[model samples]
Target: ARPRSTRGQVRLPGGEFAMGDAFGEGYPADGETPVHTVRLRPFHIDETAVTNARFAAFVKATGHVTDAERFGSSAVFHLVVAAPDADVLGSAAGAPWWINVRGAHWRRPEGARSDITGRPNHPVVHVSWNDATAYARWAGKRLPTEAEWEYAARGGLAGRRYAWGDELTPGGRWRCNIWQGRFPHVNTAEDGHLSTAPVKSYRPNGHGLWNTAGNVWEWCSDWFSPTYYAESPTVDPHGPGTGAARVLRGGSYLCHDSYCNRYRVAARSSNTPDSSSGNLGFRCANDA
Candidate 1:
């Protein structure tokens, strides 16, 4: 077999850094508090989230069917859905903006009618944790642990609000692809995208990682826990041994200050292992 390629990845020396929310701006339920220091081993991480083209290649090679493809549907935001009303299953309770569209898999992000023709460079979404793991295995990489993901996302910044800096838009320039207008309704596209942007859409962090704060929520290897920080090990913690949901870092294009502000570097969230959605994606990491 050919040696695994590390062409698009960046190797970090990896040391100690403060993990978790320092600004106290994140949700309490998400457990972004009790800031703790963590040490990491050297690793090579993808510069950007996995793209549609790469995921397509993996699928073609392995004949892997993503979770959404197996389910015959996935969650999609209402505004960009291309499926007809009949194929729309229903909306998520409380969050009606998420429509369950039939055939809304990674290839057809929005639905059966939608395609990734012009989005080859965009981050592959609608991929579940299982699907992401499959791709990682095929690529001879693995999902970064929650600690590794946060450390890489900080980009050598210490206790900052974002990957770039404290201000969202430094010098009045958009730094990421989060929602620019009203949430769940209007998106002005002020950031040049209303949904997933190209994996390298915005300026990279100090560590040369792009779209670390937005574009899509990348899956981490750790299992989800609200109070993991308090008891987490100081050296290379891997979250809890067991949990109901897997950790997801960064936010997505739908994230906004008015609603979900999890785009912050230290913020975190999670979803079921099999749950797939239009804003969910992943990047790969390897031991250096």
Candidate 2:
């Protein structure tokens, strides 16, 4: 296991929450059904996605490089670049630009041409779930189990699309971050950000965790089996033994209603453990 040097912790004063989307959040067969009860003891999580400064610390202390760095490439949504080839573009089925460009590691996504400039606070992209967990272990923390993650997400409330619930725009306010404007083609930057906003830019959830909704997807330890909701308990519930995709809790800013409407707090999506992308990053969690 790798040792991580950079970290922070957020004290989550947790209790209970309706664990699932009771407000018509998930699809009929989207595996998000069976809204249920979940209990969480108090815990702490990092306030922001691990920044370059933080990850850099981890690398410096442990001589570690992320999977994307080791793999020498990562998945890059074609929309982020000018020329999304036929294979990459046609692959996303809709976006047409999610490419697996060689040399597009965390350091050189978009193939050695792009960089994370002037956006150190933004979530670091091109990370796999494993990469996130490794960072957690090195930092002397553990990835939050599903129950812990959800409880922290609800922020002591229930049945809301967010920790605050249902209303995306409350009292004429944009609470969290999500994609703005015309899906993959046009990003209107209505939220003062285009790709990934600084994690601290958005309001923290009821738990004081920032960018939990939109910035980039955060990986949880759960193995993504949506129907697992049916068997989920009122206490700490880890996910199933084997799953095709790992659980990705927070939705990314790439999400849009016209395309991917996944920013809702209870909403969930999954990716392979090895998959990495520009809209994926993570935070650390641990016992109190």
Candidate 3:
């Protein structure tokens, strides 16, 4: 039987394109530097990040528990108030805005009492790289390689700052979700949401992909390496052979120009495979 799906996806030609920080809007230390060419064969990718309802169905079918669920806690943004617990989880060492909460798995994103409520279409959060891979396996799909991700995210626009165009906002229209107000403190929500918007909230990119620049940090299949670009293959690279952290692309709601300005299309970040957080979600990819 064909695997059931809740979200529609699109396939890209996956031809060669210029990848990385060509415009220099990204953090230099993150290795977004040195514009390079990457060629990829055709592949299919989710039009949007995996939605909560879709992930719930995966859990029901596989009877699988996410790492966050097994660990009994995950990180939540500080602005979201969850009932305190004895889990003894604390904020991250650098980003104090991320508050670790017990029982803060995907279903209860805010806390034990919090439920999906009216957010069945929101991107599923608190899923680690392992959990994302499990879902892809069950669905007979896989995570996109870092090269494939950047190539597809370009949306046929080579080396652009955003998925759409060079400008952040064209004609005063909010394109994607990102921190609008003061980071970690005030959120004006001028862009229509202070937190994760509906998966399809923004306009699709040139390739019909939505929210590829923000909303949540999408996981990439590559094992992250700051210097990997120096030695990575020119054709269909899969990132470093081994590393402690996995690549995370397309920054998240917490991203701001003043602090974490990683929302740029070529920007990159990473986290341990076992790490799970509220701003982290993923999309699936399949060979075509």
Candidate 4:
């Protein structure tokens, strides 16, 4: 029936591009080094992350139950969790900022009391890789590979610190939404957002893609390996064949230079397939 529309997707005449961190601004343990050439065929990618309204349509159409809904809870950042003390399960072992809250699904991002009331255009969160894959399947699309994501995220700019340019904020303007103030304690929200911003917030990249650097951590269709770049293929590498955690590209609103400076274009992270969180979302990609 082709229910889902590919309205804002941009088709790139994919060719070889230099992938990985060339400026050494990324963490070496995350395998952002060994910058190499990667060639991709033409493909269509969404200009912005999938919005809450779109995800609601997907759930309504397919009767999909997200991982968080199934698991009865999902990870919510400590500062923004709306649940009461009783509803909050517990904080993550190492990262005390991540508080597991019951009823924290995509519909109720913060908790049972929280809903996506006025943030229809904001990027949907509390979605796992499996959930994103299901949505992509229902929409006749797929998640972009790590290579394609980096290439597209670069927005045709090579070896730049950010998607726009080398500058994080060109001419003292906030380009993307990240932690503006002290992490986990104080959020000045100087960038005009304390949490998820609208999908189209800030200026689009050189390739007309929005929020490629921050706002949410977008899932990539790749089994993550910290040392994969050492032997990565030169053309369209789809990541490792077998791995534990799946790749997550682009840092989220919690990213800060004091701790996680991974909002850079070449930065990367990963989580399990079943893991859902408040700052985790995804966009879709399709073959041309």
The number of the candidate with the highest TM-score is 1
State which candidate has the highest lDDT.
1
Compared with the true structure, what per-residue lDDT tens digits does model 2 show for residues 1-288?
Answer: 454332467777667667767667567655776788777777778877778667666677887777777876667766675333432323555446577666676665566666766766667788898888877777788787766776777766767777677778788677666777776678887776777777787577777777778778889998988688887767777888898898887787777787665777778878899888888988888777
Note the residue pairs that clash in candidate 2: 4-138, 78-97, 78-98, 89-96, 160-165, 161-166
lDDT of 3: 0.86
Question: lDDT tens string, model 3, 1-288?
Answer: 246443476888888888788877666568876788788999889988999998998999989889998888889898885766664388889888888788899998888868887889999999999999999888778899988888778888876788888888789888888888887799888778888999998788888889998899999999988888777778889987889999999988878888877778899999999899989999988888
Instruction: Mark the regions of model 2 whose C-alpha exceeds 4 Å error after superposition.
Output: 1-7, 82-95
lDDT of 1 by residue, 30-130 (tens): 99879999999899899999999999999999899989989899999999999888989999997999999999999889898989999999999999999
Give the Cα error of residue 18 in candidate 4, in Å. Answer: 0.7
Candidate 1 vs candidate 3: the TM-score winner is 1
lDDT of 1 at 273: 99
Which of the two candidates, 1 or 3, achieves a greater lDDT against the reference? 1
Ranking by lDDT: 1, 4, 3, 2
Model 4 lDDT, residue 62, Cα: 94
TM-scores of the candidates are: 0.98, 0.89, 0.95, 0.97
Query: lDDT of all predictions, in order shown?
Result: 0.91, 0.74, 0.86, 0.90
Alpha-carbon lDDT of model 2: 0.74
Winner on lDDT between 3 and 4 is 4
Answer with 2 or 3, whichever has the higher TM-score.
3
